[PDB]
Amino acid sequence: DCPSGWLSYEQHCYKGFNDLKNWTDAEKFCTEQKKGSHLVSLHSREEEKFVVNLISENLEYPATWIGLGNMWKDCRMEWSDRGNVKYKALAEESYCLIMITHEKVWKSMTCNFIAPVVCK
Amino acid sequence: QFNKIFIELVIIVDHSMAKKCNSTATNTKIYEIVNSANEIFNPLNIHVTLIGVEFWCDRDLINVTSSADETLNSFGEWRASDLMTRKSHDNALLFTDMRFDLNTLGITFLAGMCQAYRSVGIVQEQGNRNFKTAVIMAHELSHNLGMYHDGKNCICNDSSCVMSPVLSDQPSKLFSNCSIHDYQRYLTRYKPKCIFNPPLRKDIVSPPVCGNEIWEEGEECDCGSPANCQNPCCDAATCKLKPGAECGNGLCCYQCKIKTAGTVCRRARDECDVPEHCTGQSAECPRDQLQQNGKPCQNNRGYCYNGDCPIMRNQCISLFGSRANVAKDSCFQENLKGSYYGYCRKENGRKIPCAPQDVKCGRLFCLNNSPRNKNPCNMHYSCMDQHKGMVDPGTKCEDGKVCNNKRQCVDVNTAY
Amino acid sequence: DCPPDSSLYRYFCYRVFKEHKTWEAAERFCMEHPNNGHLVSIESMEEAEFVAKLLSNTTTHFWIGLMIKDKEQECSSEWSDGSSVSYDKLGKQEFRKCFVLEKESGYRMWFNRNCEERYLFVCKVPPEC
Ligand SMILES: *[C@@H]1O[C@H](CO)[C@@H](O[C@@H]2O[C@H](CO)[C@@H](O[C@@H]3O[C@H](CO[C@@H]4O[C@H](CO)[C@@H](O)[C@H](O)[C@@H]4O)[C@@H](O)[C@H](O)[C@@H]3O)[C@H](O)[C@H]2NC(C)=O)[C@H](O)[C@H]1NC(C)=O
Ligand SMILES: *[C@@H]1O[C@H](CO)[C@@H](O[C@@H]2O[C@H](CO)[C@@H](O)[C@H](O)[C@H]2NC(C)=O)[C@H](O)[C@H]1NC(C)=O
Ligand SMILES: CNC(=O)[C@H](Cc1c[nH]c2ccccc12)NC(=O)[C@@H](CC(=O)NO)CC(C)C
Ligand SMILES: *[C@@H]1O[C@H](CO)[C@@H](O)[C@H](O)[C@H]1NC(C)=O
Ligand SMILES: *[C@@H]1O[C@H](CO)[C@@H](O)[C@H](O)[C@H]1NC(C)=O
Ligand SMILES: [Ca+2]
Ligand SMILES: [Ca+2]
Ligand SMILES: [Ca+2]
Ligand SMILES: [Ca+2]
Ligand SMILES: [Ca+2]
Ligand SMILES: [Zn+2]
Numbered sequence: 001d002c003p004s005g006w007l008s009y010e011q012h013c014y015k016g017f018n019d020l021k022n023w024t025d026a027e028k029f030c031t032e033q034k035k036g037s038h039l040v041s042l043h044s045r046e047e048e049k050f051v052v053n054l055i056s057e058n059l060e061y062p063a064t065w066i067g068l069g070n071m072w073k074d075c076r077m078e079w080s081d082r083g084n085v086k087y088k089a090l091a092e093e094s095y096c097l098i099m100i101t102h103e104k105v106w107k108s109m110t111c112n113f114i115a116p117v118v119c120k
Numbered sequence: 121q122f123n124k125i126f127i128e129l130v131i132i133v134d135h136s137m138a139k140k141c142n143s144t145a146t147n148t149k150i151y152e153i154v155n156s157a158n159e160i161f162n163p164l165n166i167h168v169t170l171i172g173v174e175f176w177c178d179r180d181l182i183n184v185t186s187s188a189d190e191t192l193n194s195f196g197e198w199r200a201s202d203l204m205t206r207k208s209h210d211n212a213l214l215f216t217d218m219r220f221d222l223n224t225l226g227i228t229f230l231a232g233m234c235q236a237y238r239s240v241g242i243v244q245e246q247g248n249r250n251f252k253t254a255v256i257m258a259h260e261l262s263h264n265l266g267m268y269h270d271g272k273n274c275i276c277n278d279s280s281c282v283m284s285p286v287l288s289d290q291p292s293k294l295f296s297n298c299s300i301h302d303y304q305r306y307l308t309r310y311k312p313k314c315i316f317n318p319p320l321r322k323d324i325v326s327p328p329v330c331g332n333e334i335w336e337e338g339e340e341c342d343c344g345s346p347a348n349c350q351n352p353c354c355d356a357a358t359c360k361l362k363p364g365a366e367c368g369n370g371l372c373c374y375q376c377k378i379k380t381a382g383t384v385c386r387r388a389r390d391e392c393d394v395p396e397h398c399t400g401q402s403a404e405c406p407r408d409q410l411q412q413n414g415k416p417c418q419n420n421r422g423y424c425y426n427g428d429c430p431i432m433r434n435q436c437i438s439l440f441g442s443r444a445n446v447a448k449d450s451c452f453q454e455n456l457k458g459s460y461y462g463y464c465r466k467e468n469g470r471k472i473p474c475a476p477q478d479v480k481c482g483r484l485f486c487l488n489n490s491p492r493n494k495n496p497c498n499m500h501y502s503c504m505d506q507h508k509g510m511v512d513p514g515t516k517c518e519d520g521k522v523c524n525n526k527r528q529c530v531d532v533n534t535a536y
Numbered sequence: 537d538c539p540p541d542s543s544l545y546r547y548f549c550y551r552v553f554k555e556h557k558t559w560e561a562a563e564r565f566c567m568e569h570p571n572n573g574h575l576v577s578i579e580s581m582e583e584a585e586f587v588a589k590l591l592s593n594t595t596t597h598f599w600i601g602l603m604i605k606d607k608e609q610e611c612s613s614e615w616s617d618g619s620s621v622s623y624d625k626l627g628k629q630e631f632r633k634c635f636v637l638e639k640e641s642g643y644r645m646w647f648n649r650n651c652e653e654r655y656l657f658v659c660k661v662p663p664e665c
Binding site for chain 3: 067
């Protein structure tokens, strides 16, 4: 059982928003919304298809940020010449994940992008 | 003149020449080439004593390609990993039929005599033109003793000395003005220790020859040719002892009489050497033996190795001068890349990176503190001389550990 | 030194090609005729400056030789809530696991790009001897 506005599924609470904003703002946002809230997480196509319809019914835009940001910035690396990677110079730009309603798949997009949020 | 020098040589006959694996004929050709070589080296007091000969009848233990540079490199790494481990010797030559590119007849490393990976040389056998082959062998061994090619004004009586960059159809048997000087310079600089005492007569495999200034089995003595012999107790011709003399040559011979037993015939050169005393039964000093490999040396700054005490700092000085020293570990990490200069072992010319535990055995990096610099990781590399620059095998890579002859930082107790 | 067609920096030579290739292709091309070659590695701020000056000295984006390990798409990242990444449906073509240098950034910033995209590159080869 979830509060007003929020829909329930399995054991969590969901809530779509049209307030378009970048990944970080979308995250900090979800937290301020409710203690323990973060961008939606998806551990199965089942939960996914649920969040999909939640969007289609409540939200205008056919997509939302999900919950993964700065995707390939803190990985284990190495140069092709087998040399070690001590020195780093990773640009501030970075990729985050978004889910498109229709094709219901995941796309990578610069976290700069402005999209609708779907807390949980 | 020069001090008597002896090169304990081992010759390798590759599959090419090993086709008709049948020895006999080959050895005869070899013995004559060698003897001829000594006849060339006489005026320099250099004596090459053949203490071994191997045949590669089965296969070629290393790929003998058309590239003389490639083959030598491969041969050098083999001579260090295989041969040296099995048989003890100073230098090693590989005799082949192989028609190398660029018309080359022989190749070796500069001032490499005594060095594990670089005391090697390649020689293309000129069929049965034995003497023309001897010149090549001489031309190389000399390059290995710091001798360069004859330039603008280097003279000899034949107008075509041994060190000419081009082998004439009737090569001289004389060394040049420049060569003599280059050699003298080699000795006062590299100070080779592995070429001072000859091998026991017992171990020389070449058929005895009187007058070759090489006391061999069957010879009563040998002060060389009657021409340049100053031995009051040896027959310059018949290699026989004069009237009242027990010996002619040997560390255990004095005033022409066999030294008494218990008398030291060969002291210990360094801390990595063990003295030898006369048996009293022969004028020939017993086989030279060095300290037990592994034994600490230089106040635990290293561990003995076939007579020497290799230490990274010194090898850095050899390469970059008195102002040089070993670089900070950080540099040796370049040896993991398996770069063109940063690697350890090589397989078929292919450079293999070092396991994180053997980085102190690949390319040596020095901190040459000489102005104009900007690189704290100096290293030596030449595609024609890649082994020089690598950490000398025997070196101490860590407390209780040393590099073996296979670019590995193994445990001293297990390396010996 | 190396006067084949590149610049020299501490024992290595940097050649710059104008052929558009994929990361995979570039690396593969860096280690063929220009033997031992590889895509530029940048191990220090000094070398970083060097490669930049080189690219600036040029008359698009360039392939850095940096690559990712571990067979995990997300690497070590997890959902913002804390849960591990159970379900994963990010199409492969959505990955941006390679890195390039770009003029806008002064050739001193590493940006993620699809390893399949075709950009310019710079090999770090050995010197002539
Ligand atoms: C997602 O969007 C957010 C906001 O839209 C981006 O965050 C913003 O990032 C910039 C830096 O690129 C911050 O600017 C700095 O501001 C400080 C002054 O402090 C701030 O001042 C503003 C008003 O001036 C206040 O509203 C803030 O609360 C705070 O006090 C200044 O000293 C710096 O020189 C610099 O200009 C900006 O403050 C920040 N906005 C906030 C408050 O979130 C974010 O970059 C972007 N991220 C992604 C995923 O691209
Ligand atoms: C070997 O001897 C030759 C000649 O005996 C030396 O060469 C001479 O070099 C001087 C340099 O000033 C010339 O002017 C002479 O003409 C050269 N001699 C001739 C006529 O050939 C040579 O220097 C000697 N080798 C060395 C360097 O020891
Ligand atoms: C016929 N083969 C050879 O003797 C060639 C000849 C050669 C070299 N440069 C040339 C340019 C024009 C024509 C021929 C040659 N030279 C060699 O093999 C010499 C190689 C060398 O420098 N060894 O240290 C070692 C040798 C002197 C014993
Ligand atoms: C070179 O010789 C080695 C044996 O020492 C062999 O394994 C290798 O295959 C040879 N090279 C080639 C490519 O045939
Ligand atoms: C590269 O830069 C150097 C000076 O930094 C300059 O001399 C050279 O001409 C430049 N390359 C070319 C060919 O423009
Ligand atoms: Ca003599
Ligand atoms: Ca010896
Ligand atoms: Ca003799
Ligand atoms: Ca001794
Ligand atoms: Ca967790
Ligand atoms: Zn030569």
